Design a protein that fits this description.
metal binding protein; oxygen sensor; metal-binding; Four Helix Bundle (Hemerythrin (Met), subunit A); mainly alpha; 5 helices; helix bundle
């Protein structure tokens, strides 16, 4: 009753990646509690940490892609870039348009965790593991 997103064995990936993906999960759940609270101060605070961390995380994945010539680097990097664009837009709508904007961004963040952080990222795991990345 408290949590929006939970870890799953299907999200599990390289251990260094898990560390970062787990942090995104916690930020999503933080934003969820802030919206339930409800509490726009916290929501904007959490959103900023989420925004910065997501960008750092995308930076780390792209560093691995480049170093190891991951064949789908270009597509994956562009998906990240498009999401960051989206995130900047949400940051504008969330400051402080309505309070239900935070709900539309939570809907977007759940979709992103399920379709990207799980489904899309899982694609790089074997290739990188093969080459000694963990």
């Amino acid at each position: 009753a408290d949590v929006l997103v939970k870890w799953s064995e299907d999200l599990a990936n390289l251990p260094s990646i898990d560390t970062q993906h787990k942090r995104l999960v916690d930020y999503i759940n933080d934003l969820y509690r802030a919206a339930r609270r409800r509490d726009m101060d916290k929501a904007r605070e959490v959103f900023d940490a989420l925004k910065n961390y997501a960008v750092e995380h995308f930076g780390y994945e792209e560093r691995l892609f480049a170093d190891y010539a991951y064949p789908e680097a270009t597509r994956h990097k562009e998906i990240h870039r498009r999401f960051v664009e989206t995130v900047l837009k949400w940051e504008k709508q969330l400051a402080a348009g309505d309070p239900e904007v935070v709900m539309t961004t939570l809907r977007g963040l759940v979709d992103w965790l399920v379709n990207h952080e799980m489904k899309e990222d899982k694609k790089y795991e074997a290739y990188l593991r093969e080459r000694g990345v963990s």
